[PDB]
Amino acid sequence: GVPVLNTPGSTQFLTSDDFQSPSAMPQFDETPEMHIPGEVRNLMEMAEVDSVVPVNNITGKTKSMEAYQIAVGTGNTDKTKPIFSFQMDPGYSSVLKRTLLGEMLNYYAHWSGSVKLTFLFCGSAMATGKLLISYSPPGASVPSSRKDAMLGTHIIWDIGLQSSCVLCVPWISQSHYRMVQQDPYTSAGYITCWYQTNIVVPPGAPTSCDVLCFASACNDFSVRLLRDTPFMAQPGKL
Amino acid sequence: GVPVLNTPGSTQFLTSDDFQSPSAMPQFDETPEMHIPGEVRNLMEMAEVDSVVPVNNITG
Amino acid sequence: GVPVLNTPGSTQFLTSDDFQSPSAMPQFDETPEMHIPGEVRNLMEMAEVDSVVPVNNITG
Amino acid sequence: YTNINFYKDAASSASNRQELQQDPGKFTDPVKDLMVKTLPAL
Amino acid sequence: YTNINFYKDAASSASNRQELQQDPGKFTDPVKDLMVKTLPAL
Amino acid sequence: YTNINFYKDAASSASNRQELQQDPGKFTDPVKDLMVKTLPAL
Amino acid sequence: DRVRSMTLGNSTITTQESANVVVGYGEWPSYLSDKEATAEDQPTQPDVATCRFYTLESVQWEKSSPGWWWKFPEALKNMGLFGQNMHYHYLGRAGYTIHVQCNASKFHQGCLLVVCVPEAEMGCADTSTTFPATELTTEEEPHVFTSDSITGKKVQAAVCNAGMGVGVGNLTIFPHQWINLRTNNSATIVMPYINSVPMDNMFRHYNFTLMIIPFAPLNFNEGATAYVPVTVTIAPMYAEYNGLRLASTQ
Amino acid sequence: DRTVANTQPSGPSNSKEIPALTAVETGHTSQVDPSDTLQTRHVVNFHSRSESTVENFMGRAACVFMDQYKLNSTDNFAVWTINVREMAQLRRKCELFTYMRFDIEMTMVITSCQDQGTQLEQDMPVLTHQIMYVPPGGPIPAKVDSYEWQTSTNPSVFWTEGNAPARMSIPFISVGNAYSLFYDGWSHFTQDGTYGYTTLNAMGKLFVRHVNKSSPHQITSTIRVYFKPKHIKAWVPRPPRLCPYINKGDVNFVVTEVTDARKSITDTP
Amino acid sequence: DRTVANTQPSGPSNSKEIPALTAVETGHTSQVDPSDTLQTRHVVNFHSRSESTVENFMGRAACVFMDQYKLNSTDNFAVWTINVREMAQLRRKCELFTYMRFDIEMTMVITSCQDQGTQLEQDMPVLTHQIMYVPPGGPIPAKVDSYEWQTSTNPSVFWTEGNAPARMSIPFISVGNAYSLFYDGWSHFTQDGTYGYTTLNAMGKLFVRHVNKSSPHQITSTIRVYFKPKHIKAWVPRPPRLCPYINKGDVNFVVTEVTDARKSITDTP
Amino acid sequence: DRTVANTQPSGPSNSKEIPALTAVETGHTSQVDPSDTLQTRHVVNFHSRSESTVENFMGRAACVFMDQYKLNSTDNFAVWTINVREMAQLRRKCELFTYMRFDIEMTMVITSCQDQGTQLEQDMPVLTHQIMYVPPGGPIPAKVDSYEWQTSTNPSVFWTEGNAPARMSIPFISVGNAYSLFYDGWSHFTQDGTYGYTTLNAMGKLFVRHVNKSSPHQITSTIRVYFKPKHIKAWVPRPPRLCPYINKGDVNFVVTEVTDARKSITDTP
Ligand SMILES: CCCCCCCCCCCCCCCC(=O)O
Ligand SMILES: CCCCCCCCCCCCCCCC(=O)O
Ligand SMILES: CCCCCCCCCCCCCCCC(=O)O
């Protein structure tokens, strides 16, 4: 007859608890294990893998293959205007919301780390050109000229044999963590591209080419708070 | 007054559980054991024994 | 089946008690601490600080 | 745990569910004379 | 008892109600130069 | 506590929530030949 | 590093512009061990006869081509002694190396994605019924995707979802390589055996699916060659078979 | 529980090293760090990827089944085939891997409510419920008072209302070496039958009933089951499902959109 | 918990050894292994015969008795002679051995329900039940308020409704060295009386009743008893019973069929 | 647990030491002791400042929320944004410091009562309640039978009435290094939006509902939540709030009086 006193919180079911429970099947023998290649252990490994980003999310292209194609041209017209522009925020920006990084980010409410974006030039081997890609830290309006975009984190890409260049955002934030949802207190910056030089092609070559972008997380990325994804809904019984 | 917290799954009866229970008859003395030939211990021993198979299971 | 006997005072909520309780969020990682100047530890430190006294509390 | 008895009586104990002992020779081979598989039976 | 934790998490622990540490010098004496009670202040 | 098992069965145990092991090289770097970041890829 | 040479059996493949080969998940294919074995018999292990390159039919990459898919290992039947052993054997194990060839001049542009999806499951266009097995596998010609929603007792071949109900751009998680006409003209992927059971019947189970989807459309000017062929070559490796009986006519 | 990598100081550099330039046709993901392309200071990172693990991600209960049985023909008991493809919330999470091994920790919640009628005057004692798991191939009851209810060998749980919810643990009970969520094959060897993962799913059925024989007026009850996977191992990560689910049996879907439409290519909200 | 035997490699052989040939008139079962007649590889078997043991096979509760008693003459209490030949589910399992020693772990489930009447307005407190085991030769109660109910020496259990089911353990209480399930003899020495196993069964009776004296309206209760054998030993295995049971007292049966009829000798479905 | 300082003996003194004289413009508080200006004896003080600590001061439960939900549209469930600025009793205590780190130990008390109606004859079983904490950004239920209630990832607690009150523990879940009770800033970078501490408060919502589907007659329930901070650290002490609170969102106030009026300067009651 050991004297015991019950404490508040007894006889309750909490989803996030670890308690021992009696086994329904006693002394069951399981099948021997086998080595299956490709064992994932953490969910950040999937985030690190590169995925294509639907930059051209304009109307009429969200249900086709043209959403991933960033068109480039060779001309004298509109050489002072941005090629593309979007928000750096991975959580809610439509451009990169549904990517592999975004999908895993929508199961969490906090995030931190750095993100890297690479660009592939899908054009003729004889074509050559240069491009300027810049990241503007938050605190000012979106840049409207290349003079405004050359005062931030920028890299000059020379198209050639390598055919790919990587841009890294170096985690400039006031706090240690940011919020996946849109909140004015914590927000990222903007990504913009500009023409360093025009694209020159020899006679007999296609005039227009395409560029594709890939986004992935760095080795210092982490997520702390756990929530449910907002991309799934069940109206009725299946 | 040791503080304890009840866990889900209490006050239930599961057929396949092993728990100690109070004895109805305390200090009962059983009859001494005796050696009875033919002690089965596993149910696969009976399976190993050969048995006739009704192959001709046709009607009648 | 350890025999236990409940004692009076069980299944009650007292405001001034210290008991362990299950955690809603398991294995959560908190933000690293930072040194913030001006850490109060006892409430008598605030009492020791001098304050102005409204002696002339007359009407108006 | 799993080896502590809180009751004096022996019947007030858990079942022995981790014992594995076999002896199929009682039924499969009841012959008095030894028979070799390689050698002919008769 | 009173020093045994039955839960792995650190937040699932009792409050620290037996700690007594004080430092009134932060607020009572914030002056850069030392002041002696016996000696005149100025 | 936290390391005592009151049940013989292995499935009747708490979840392993304090294990941290990673291997991103399986997916990030599946190439047969080693690639150096400083050196050109091709 | 561009040049590479692969020799298996009595066949050899030579390439002058290519990238480093990709091993699936970092594990080279091998033979089953005794501890992981479950069968009780002596496996037959042909080496030269059933492990060599087999060149499939080629296809033309037109400007409006949406893509193609193949469902191995059934596509490898009736070719050589690999298919013949399949008919007479209930169980089998094998590994594969996939080489895809597509060449163009310096005045042509375009990009291709080559990816192997393990245990890819295809849904029907009509959600309330199922499709015949002919739609998934034909064993002679590649099945083509489409750029619009289709109807009937057929798979949803829309390139947007790829027939699996997932984003087309997220397929890079699986082992893959890219074929950019400006840089390379050949892609090689080595895949190990991946299955829940150590061995399984080849005919009724489709281990993996090879999908080629053009992200960048092919474009060229007048006077250039308009017929660009795409050829796929696969070679089984470490073939093992257990269980011998009468041949299965299928 | 180790932390993430720290940042190393960098300075101006002019040389032939090209960390930024790479080739994406090889199939390799670049390992460039922010220090490689910018001038950075030295910071010590104590952040840990402790909640991103598969075990912690899957370690939370989710609803899998819901049904109603009444006490006053076939409405007095409920029958459920044990499958994890009936609730979208848990189906999406478990379809990110091809093969998985795990041990479930099932729990149930049972509630009862009197039905609205003209006459409601009644006094009833406490209620008791029985849950029986029939192994595959076992006899299935056809009536509330059928002979299968006496569980000589099958497991059973009896839970009187008012107490804590019942909980049980089940080990790995798959014939193969793992649970195959996606199966690309046909049941028959002639490439016929049922195409999908239904062939490999051979889990048994579950039966719930009221122990009390009768009540003066009708009473209805609802049972909800929650599953928590533990001791979990995963293989072959898969992309998330974009399109909403249509039917539990198959993976049929409708054409959807990759991302939300924007006004223009250079439109920043 | 050892595993089963592994397979050893074999090769082609031509010699005078004849493992396959044997004689079945000797009464010995052949010990031929698959390696002896075929060419086999080497495999390591980790399968264990852990659930085929008698203790694990018998280690599961089964229903043995069911009856109803009412609260408002002889209907207020129930009388049961303790026998294991009343439920077919457990009778078939325990008739595979001639002699057995075991210790039971009995448990009971008690439910109550109000009876359907014209007037049902009543308010009643919780109910309590008493179960008494009368040793062989002891006085048997004849009324609910009889004097035998005060258990000076007999065991008793009181269980208020709403709590966990009661459980008790009983040791080996047989006069002989084991429980004789099958007895081929007559009670009297003149080869007369009752033929069967009823003579050796001398177990006592069980009595259940309501502790509460009366209720404004009739209430009925049902008790179910489950037995789990533990610390079990078995002797003389017996073939399973083919024909369905007819009467609890004896082993009388009707002529049945060995196997299901097939179309022909060479008919494969 | 040390004691306070003891008193030291003093005697008559005539010298140039001036402990009493000081300057208050320096910003330093004088450290004069009673022995310095008077003749005192020697006493040993054993008094300890053990209950003046911040941890003990904050270590007591306080009510933070109260609402009603009914069982019979949007009245069947309650929604609460987790904030500590709704009850004056705890708001005043927690506004004495600018920044604070603490771990709460929440508990709930749930009571139910039948509503007064013309017809009150009903018999109902025990009631069960569910409490779900939606993380920030998570979907919010819009109906009692909505799909968000199946907590695949969100935490939940089920408490049957009649048992002990439920209790849970929550760790430090702030993005920053501490909880900023007072924030002197604007949400937007253009000095617009909402001014106050509401911008930094990003805590999630709480949902409570009835598990039982329906009742013959309406029943209403009330839930009260209590918070106890533990493992607490405080910074930047602040003066107590004089004026009574007006609105939870902001710190708006009305002009009040410093002290109670007296008759005259030399008036002693
Ligand atoms: C009610 C008491 C007995 C309950 C027995 C346990 C319930 C049986 C469920 C076993 C299968 C669990 C895992 C299957 C998941 C899957 O099919 O992928
Ligand atoms: C109700 C409390 C007292 C109960 C006493 C225990 C019940 C008596 C049963 C004893 C016999 C058990 C084993 C007999 C089986 C058999 O007859 O073969
Ligand atoms: C009902 C079970 C789940 C309950 C989850 C815990 C409740 C969430 C509250 C977290 C915030 C606590 C501290 C916030 C105080 C503040 O805002 O200053």
Numbering used by the authors:
A (entry chain C): 1 to 238
B (entry chain C), C (entry chain C): 1 to 60
D (entry chain D), E (entry chain D), F (entry chain D): 27 to 68
G (entry chain B): 11 to 260
H (entry chain A), I (entry chain A), J (entry chain A): 5 to 76, 81 to 277
From the paper:
Echovirus 18 (E18), as a member of enterovirus species B, is a significant causative agent of aseptic meningitis and viral encephalitis in children. Echoviruses belong to enterovirus species B (EV-B) of the Enterovirus genus within the Picornaviridae family, which are single-stranded, positive RNA viruses (~30 nm) without a lipid envelope (nonenveloped virus). We describe the mechanism for the entry of certain EV-B serotypes by using FcRn as a two-in-one attachment-and-uncoating receptor. Protomers consist of the capsid protein (VP1, VP2, and VP3) and the smaller internal protein VP4.
E18 (strain HeB15-254) was purified by sucrose density centrifugation, and the fractions of mature virus particles were collected. Detailed characterizations of mature E18 particles, the E18/FcRn complex under physiological conditions (pH 7.4), and the E18/FcRn complex under acidic conditions (pH 5.5) were performed. The density map of all three particles showed clear protein backbones and side chains of most residues, which allowed us to build the atomic model. The E18 mature particle has a pseudo-T=3 symmetry arrangement resembling other picornavirus architectures. Sixty copies of the protomer-packaged mature particles had a diameter of 30 nm. The mature E18 particles alone did not exhibit significant changes under acidic conditions.
